[PDB]
Amino acid sequence: FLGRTGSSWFKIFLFYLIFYGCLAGIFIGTIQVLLLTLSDFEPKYQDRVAPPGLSHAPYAIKTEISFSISNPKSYESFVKSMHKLMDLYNESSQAGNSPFEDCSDTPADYIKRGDLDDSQGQKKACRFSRMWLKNCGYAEGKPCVVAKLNRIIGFYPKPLKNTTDLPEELQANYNQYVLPLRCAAREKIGSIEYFGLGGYAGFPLQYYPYYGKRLQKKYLQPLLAIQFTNLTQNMELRIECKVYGENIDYSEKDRFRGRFEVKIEVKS
Amino acid sequence: EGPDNDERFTYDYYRLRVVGLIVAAVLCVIGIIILLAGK
Amino acid sequence: LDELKKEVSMDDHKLSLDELHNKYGTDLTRGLTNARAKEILARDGPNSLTPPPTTPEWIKFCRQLFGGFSILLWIGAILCFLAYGIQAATEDEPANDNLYLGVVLSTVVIVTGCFSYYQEAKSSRIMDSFKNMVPQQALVIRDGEKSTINAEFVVAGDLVEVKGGDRIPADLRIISAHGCKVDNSSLTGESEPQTRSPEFSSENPLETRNIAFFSTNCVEGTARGVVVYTGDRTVMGRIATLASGLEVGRTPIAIEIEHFIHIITGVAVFLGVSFFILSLILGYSWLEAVIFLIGIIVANVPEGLLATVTVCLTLTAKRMARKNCLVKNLEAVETLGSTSTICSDKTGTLTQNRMTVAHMWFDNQIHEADTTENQSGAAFDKTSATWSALSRIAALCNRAVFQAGQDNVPILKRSVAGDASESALLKCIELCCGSVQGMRDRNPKIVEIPFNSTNKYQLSIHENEKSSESRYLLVMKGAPERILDRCSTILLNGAEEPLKEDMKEAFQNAYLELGGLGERVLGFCHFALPEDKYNEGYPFDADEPNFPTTDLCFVGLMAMIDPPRAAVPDAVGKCRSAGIKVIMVTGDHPITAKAIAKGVGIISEGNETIEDIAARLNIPIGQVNPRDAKACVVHGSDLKDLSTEVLDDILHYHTEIVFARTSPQQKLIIVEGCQRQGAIVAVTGDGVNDSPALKKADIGVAMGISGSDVSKQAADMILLDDNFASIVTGVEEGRLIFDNLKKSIAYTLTSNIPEITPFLVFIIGNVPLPLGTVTILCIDLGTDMVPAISLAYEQAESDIMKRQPRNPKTDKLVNERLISMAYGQIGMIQALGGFFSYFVILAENGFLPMDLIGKRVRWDDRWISDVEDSFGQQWTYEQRKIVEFTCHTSFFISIVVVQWADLIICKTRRNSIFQQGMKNKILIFGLFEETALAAFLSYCPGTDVALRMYPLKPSWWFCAFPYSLIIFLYDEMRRFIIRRSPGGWVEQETYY
Ligand SMILES: *[C@@H]1O[C@H](CO)[C@@H](O[C@@H]2O[C@H](CO)[C@@H](O)[C@H](O)[C@H]2NC(C)=O)[C@H](O)[C@H]1NC(C)=O
Ligand SMILES: CC(C)CCC[C@@H](C)[C@H]1CC[C@H]2[C@@H]3CC=C4C[C@@H](O)CC[C@]4(C)[C@H]3CC[C@]12C
Ligand SMILES: *[C@@H]1O[C@H](CO)[C@@H](O)[C@H](O)[C@H]1NC(C)=O
Ligand SMILES: [K+]
Ligand SMILES: [Mg+2]
Ligand SMILES: [Tl+]
């Protein structure tokens, strides 16, 4: 033929069949032992998610949400993702004492449901009403963005203490139980309005620590609705929403490390 | 610890780099020694 | 074009002096007119040689920039700029990826260009050396007056004059001469002075006395002649053009390189476009379809391989430089290993090029002297009183002297003023009797008759050094038979005795044997003149026989030859044991050529020519079956009337071939004949008459000390110490580097698979990219480099000089067996070890292997800063990318770890590491430096930006260890099978 005879062509097939078969069987074996060394409830390493990311619902083309108020299908793209998220926080999804629980309607302290063990059933998560998100189809004019803190197993978000000076200096400082979120731009051509649990501009600490998908399915993380009823129009406004805390840090590279990058433009 | 389990989300990449560079250097020296056993 | 120049020349030495003038419109006495000479100048053109048109270095460099790998790397470099252009227009990408990767790849092409350019070097100044043989000026007779003119202004027809010490300015017809002798070594390779006279003495113009040639010099006397040829039209000017004009051609090693380039280029374009369409079918945007292609290019092309080859060659050439063997062309480092036929000059190559005493006949006994340079033999006789009598004649009846200031150099190597035979005798006595000058001071010469054409003897009368005599001793030497007709007694073991027919017959026997050995034989005799008949003041007349020259005492015979170099016989046998055919090709006479052939082992004992059979059986040569003769001796005059097909039959039908009295073109023809049969041929030589053959040879080797400038220009290799044993070393080195290149190539190729497979699974699996493009270049250009080179220092696995020369048609540098092992077996194991570490990194950070399938869509989505892992955690864009790049880093390090084992297995093709050992210090160096480089690239701060290399946790380093070990075991088991059964299965499938 090309290389060899039929007899040789066969033998080279019988070899590579057994050979690659063995190699596949060995590869799988090493994957088995790897998995055997891992927990079902907690990942081996967590230093790469460490400082929590802050992500929002409006799917930004490039950290930007520009549209026209005087146009219907101009914002119907951002309403798709906005709906996708909030559709999960339905009351019909949170039914019965299992696996949900009614928690303080005001920001409270942490809740420990034991260890990362299966020695108990599904760890009961705090309910969250999308109805706590006042004012927010969504904002056809002047968007109503929804913030979110990335989930990390066993992470206890710790707010800053009012020992020294603060950006939003001491205003509504629920020091003991709220992780604040203050959006900014100089360039003050807007109108910041925050909505959340208990009416505070933060995340209620009663939703922590997260026990993971395996030990807490259907779990709901707290949301923080933000509305920009800015009196300006037809210009790119670089708005940055920042979260503050002891366990919260940022990076010049990762522009989502505990903060937002939104470029709103109501070009109408 | 409980609420004070910050060490869980931390890794000493600084020491690791110091050690890694020490090792790389020493392996580089060892190599020179064996090569220079005759030039 | 040069087929005309490969033919024997035609001449006009047969014409009379007068007749020759009519042909050139010339005067025998007055010479040309100033006006007629200038007319002929403009007519024929200058008496000069024009160098052939060369290829500029520009075109030579750029021709390498387009050879398979460079072509693919160019397509990659441009395709980078393509994707970059498409980006800069569509979505403003502030990145530098495609732009920088395009710059990097273009640089890789340029630098790789320098390496191949360095390897494909051609240092040739043939025509320049020939031009150096034309004198600046010549002496001509114009308008009846002699004047010096620019030799280029010399034309056919003018009257030229030459004298001892000057170069022949052009081909001349001798019309007048006085004691003129010439050095025709340019045409023959033999430096013994040849007389020139107006008389025609041979039909063959290269042998007649009435022609003098350009490229030669007058050694003594004076001559006048008419110019018959000028410039390019001279006999050796044509040889110049032939030699300088010959197409170089591709080396065996070069052909091998291009061959695997086709193979690897083939699989590259195959998988390249095979997966380019496979991606579009899967609905991949052309934006991405090209990005994957660039990666495929980089994965398939072994970026550092061609440069490795060059370095391995260079390092092999450095070792040979250290044995006095200079390599002018890097590729010639290997040709000697692939050589199946050596065509060797005799004089100054196989031989020392110096008349040396070989045997002596005295006391009715043949004695043998030591002919070797360094005198590696033993003594023959010292005791016999006869010896001292013969020794005295050899010293006394000798007019040769050592040049001043030689006392530093060895006797046999020092320059001597005199003819070759007298120098030989001088050096013979000086060696075994001490200072000859002393013997010539103790015995003052009073009268002598120098060797005469008519007398055929030379005699001398000396004052006997003996005090009790202080009388007159007569000594003489000459033609053995002439000396015999002048002898009455023979000095036997001390005492004289009558010359009976018995001893006279033993003389003839001794004389015939020595002459049969191709040796020049001389007779020696002396006579102690009677005291009473010769007073202490008796005057001797040299002009008229004033003393007896008959009834003298015969002392002995001495024989001499230009002997082989000490190492030559043994080197010839070694070449022949390696299955290399050795042919002699010489301008010298057949009797001498044949005798040295037997001396060095070109013709082995018992082997006969058709002429030998005929003489032994006493039958006509036509009655001899030519197939009964394995040896042959072909004279150039017969070679001339043979067609190439008939030359091919001679080459095919004889194992032991001697081509004697060959011209320079004839040497070229014999070389081409050998090549025509499909053989790789080496030429060894030292003369300008070897230049065409040396050029045409697959590899020409010139002698460094004895070699002429031309020969060393025409060669690929120079033996700087004239050590012929270096050929044996060269062939051995050549074979070793050929095997080691295979090892180094397999090693380099093996790591291509773990660079290809990640890109494929990236498409078919939709997982995060396991390894990056930049990461690949850190391997092929970084870590693999020193290890790959180090394989050039591997010792032989068996006695390579015991095997036959490779068949260049069947035995390839890269075959299917190499690809099967490198791509199908070992590289495949490396790929898995890479993937394993990849799955380990991701799974330990929260992305278990199961959830990875079909996630790249969301993984690469820059706007999703919340991807969910297996544990329910959310990752930003840059966070997951850090883990991904950490995956690139550990996959990279996994390659390094699996290349550890590969380096050790590529060490040997057959033998076990437990047999070959670990005595390669460069290889061990490679292991340490490779690992140092990898660690540095991972842990050095800032490398995460420039190369996207991230620090690895200690446990990460050990992921591929079980795969590294399986490689070592697998290959060790496999080679154990090879050795345990030379049959073929494992052998014919995987044996590189
Ligand atoms: C989650 O809540 C949303 C609230 O808008 C539900 O949307 C409803 O969709 C139905 C049918 O398309 C409409 O008739 C209603 O007007 C919507 N709102 C309400 C309050 O009922 C959505 O269907 C819910 N999703 C799930 C899975 O239950
Ligand atoms: C990533 C995976 C799926 C690709 C696997 C590719 C396999 C099928 C390839 C890789 C190397 C290949 C072999 C390389 C060498 C030879 C020897 C030659 O004389 C015949 C073909 C043969 C035997 C090839 C057959 C196919 C082969 C085994
Ligand atoms: C939000 O909606 C409420 C009614 O639910 C209305 O009273 C109020 O004006 C709205 N706020 C703004 C800022 O438009
Ligand atoms: K050559
Ligand atoms: Mg010679
Ligand atoms: Tl490569």
Ligand SMILES: [Tl+]
């Ligand atoms: Tl490679």
